[PDB]
């Protein structure tokens, strides 16, 4: 049984469009992504390209900013899937991301259907980055650790919130942490599911298109919900 009407929009393969306009330490960049999401299997695959030349930041720092609707919620947890319940009208996803001993991103995204396409349209601003740090200096490995993100209800805002740390492998040993502070709120007025506390388990793969000459990232994400 479908617990929310929005759940029905994800039974098949859903086309995805991602658009990001960024500005980090004054360096402007634009990223466009296309792919598809398969919530039955908790999976999404996208190819992202820079339309503005070589990116001023590493692709791994953009992974979390560049689609929680595609997580697989097990049958006993369908009542906790806020993300699909907010569809098709969608939700706003806002974050602050603080990089350990470095600058920070502020992001605001709208995730919603435009026609039959799930669109993620993002503005990102980055401030206070070190010229020779791991971000502006491109010192992060091209991979992504698995992370469990604790999701809680934000009842006053009729949405969800999360705070979590990602760990980014630094070239030649060590890890750099990124503290994420996240709030999601529905765009429409229709009723949404507010979840009990639970976790989303993420696993990600970063790859390249051998025929793409522009700066780019191919991303696979596999995400499942688990109760406590």
Numbering used by the authors: -1 to 64, 68 to 229
Paper text:
We solved the crystal structures of hfYFP (to 1.7-Å resolution), a monomeric variant, monomeric hyperfolder YFP (mhYFP) (1.6 Å), and a cysteine-free mGL variant called FOLD6 (1.2 Å), shedding light on structure–function relationships underpinning their brightness and stability. Through structure-guided engineering and screening based on GdnHCl unfolding kinetics and melting temperature (Tm) alongside rigorous spectroscopic characterization, we produced a series of avFP mutants demonstrating superior stability over sfGFP in diverse biochemical assays. Each FP crystallized as a monomer with no asymmetric unit.
Using structure-guided engineering, we conferred the NaOH resistance that we first identified in FOLD6 into hfYFP and enhanced hfYFP’s monomericity in one step, producing mhYFP whose spectral properties are identical to hfYFP’s. hfYFP and FOLD6 have potential to serve similar functions as sfGFP, such as multiple epitope tag insertion, extremophile research, bimolecular fluorescence complementation, sensor stabilization, circular permutation and random mutagenesis. The high-resolution crystal structures of hfYFP, mhYFP and FOLD6 that we solved to 1.7-Å, 1.6-Å and 1.2-Å resolution, respectively, offer excellent templates for biosensor engineering, particularly when combined with our characterization data, library development approach for the GFPs/YFPs, LSS FPs and structural interpretations.
